[PDB]
């Protein structure tokens, strides 16, 4: 019965505005590193690769480096919160996340940028 919910399927943020997107998963009070694996993607681009407490920076995509970080503290709560600072038009698209803690599931999130 391990399913993983998103709050909202569509985020609509302006250019330059900092964004953060969420993926709520079940946690049994406390959290285990050896169990937890998290991943983020947008059109086959490595955004986050988090394996039991190991973000490798080389593996991340070149056009995401000083901007796309996952909030570490948020995972204690039971939420993979991916942050982007200084949003671009280029970042607009469909964002996959994948999570494995006990069970496993994934979800897609549409992201559409604006520009005044």
């Amino acid at each position: 019965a391990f399913t993983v919910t998103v709050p909202k399927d569509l985020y609509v943020v302006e250019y330059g505005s900092n964004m953060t997107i969420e993926c709520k998963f079940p946690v049994e009070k406390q959290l285990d590193l050896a169990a937890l694996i998290v991943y983020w993607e947008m059109e086959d681009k490595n955004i986050i690769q988090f394996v039991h407490g190991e973000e490798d920076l080389k593996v991340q995509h070149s056009s995401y480096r000083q901007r796309a970080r996952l909030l570490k503290d948020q995972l204690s709560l039971g939420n993979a919160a991916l942050q982007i600072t200084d949003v671009k038009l280029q970042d607009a698209g469909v964002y996959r996340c994948m999570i494995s803690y006990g069970g496993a599931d994934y979800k897609r999130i549409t992201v559409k940028v604006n520009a005044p």
Copy 2:
């Protein structure tokens, strides 16, 4: 480091010819159901959803029903072997898998159909 290899990144099969595609993963002598979760996809279409020894048939896509089955015996060997019988042009495309047994990973496989 739990990584999951494909033998070949491109399968080239004729129309009507039966196809089978592979995803080799590590197994530590014996295999555990409660651990293993497997999934198959092609352009956001549910092909297989296998959760600790549970294929649900309703969840599978409508245009895949009497054709796309995963070989159960093959998983003992350490290989998710997805079979399609009676291949169509419609089935040609990019096939995602993905697997969680101990660790987790995913891989894409290009599939290009022929007809002489």
